[PDB]
Design a protein around this ligand. Structure first.
Ligand SMILES: c1ccc(CC2NCCN2)cc1
Ligand SMILES: [Mg+2]
Ligand SMILES: [Mg+2]
Length: 283
């Protein structure tokens, strides 16, 4: 706990490498010449367009960040929204983002985890929160998501993934041990207590809960471009980043950002956008 708190970093530091929306997830460069900011909106659209959202439905955002996904959903689809975050800062910002919207739709932000959320919702989106949940909680997660949705329910989960050690060993022993050590660094120093799933885990746990799971979308090339821009931006802001934190924290995040770009490029990490369809989902 204390040792993990050593890895707490100011929101101000994150602002020195992210786009103006402060999206801390894979952008979607379609078309390829989008700015990072436009690509973060495109990634939100990529997720929401999979969810068969109709006016007056309620969308649940599990890990709602700074509220960008929820705002886009209200504005584009005329839906009610509920977001879950455990960040007090993100909670306050989401309430202000949603209050700003010209709408009669209900907007709610809860400072709580999915474990404590048991209200009926139409559709669920979760963008790069899943890596915090832990393997032993995946069955409870998919069961909760299945049970709170109607017969035509759908969910997207976007998550960074690694491969089963067996599969990693297939793509060179030297690279398997080197990748495992970097993943340990990610889930120790960058996201304390994190644990990467595999795409196969994300699929099989959904199926066991009763979801239909089509072929997941790989975002690998998009995450490479995202991490290149994040790294280039942090580096261009080096002095300011050291002033707000320390040389230690700057070096840690340069290692994270360049490191991830490398292991994504070498196809030892991936990013999967998995769609989960309830049996009564529209065709
Ligand atoms: C391990 C734990 C959490 C995460 C989620 C995440 N947050 C920002 C970008 N990825 C990834 C990997
Ligand atoms: Mg902000
Ligand atoms: Mg490297």
């Amino acid at each position: 706990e204390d040792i993990q708190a050593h890895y707490d970093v100011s929101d101000d530091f994150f602002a020195l490498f992210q786009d103006p929306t402060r999206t801390y997830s894979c952008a979607y460069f379609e078309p390829p010449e989008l700015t990072l900011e436009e690509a973060q909106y495109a990634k939100v659209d990529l997720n929401l367009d999979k969810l068969d959202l109709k006016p007056g439905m309620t969308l649940l955002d599990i890990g709602c960040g700074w509220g960008t996904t929820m705002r886009r959903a209200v504005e584009r689809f005329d839906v009610n929204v509920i977001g879950l975050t455990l960040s007090k800062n993100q909670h306050a910002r989401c309430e202000q983002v949603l209050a700003s919207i010209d709408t009669n739709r209900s907007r709610q932000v809860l400072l709580q985890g999915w474990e404590d959320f048991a209200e009926p919702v139409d559709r669920i989106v979760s963008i790069e929160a899943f890596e915090h949940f832990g393997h032993e909680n995946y069955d409870d997660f998919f069961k909760r998501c299945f049970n709170i949705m109607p017969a035509d329910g759908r969910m997207t989960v976007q998550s960074s993934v690694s491969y089963h050690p067996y599969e990693m060993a297939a793509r060179g022993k030297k690279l398997s041990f080197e990748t495992a050590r970097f993943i340990k660094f990610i889930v120790t120093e960058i996201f304390p207590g994190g644990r990467l799933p595999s795409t196969e885990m994300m699929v099989e746990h959904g199926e066991k809960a009763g979801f239909t799971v089509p072929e997941p979308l790989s975002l690998r090339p998009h995450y490479i471009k995202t991490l290149r821009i994040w790294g280039d931006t942090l580096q261009s802001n080096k002095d300011k980043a050291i002033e707000v934190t320390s040389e230690e924290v700057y070096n840690r995040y340069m290692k994270y950002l360049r490191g991830c770009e490398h292991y994504f490029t070498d196809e030892m990490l991936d990013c999967s956008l998995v769609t989960y369809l309830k049996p009564g989902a529209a065709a």
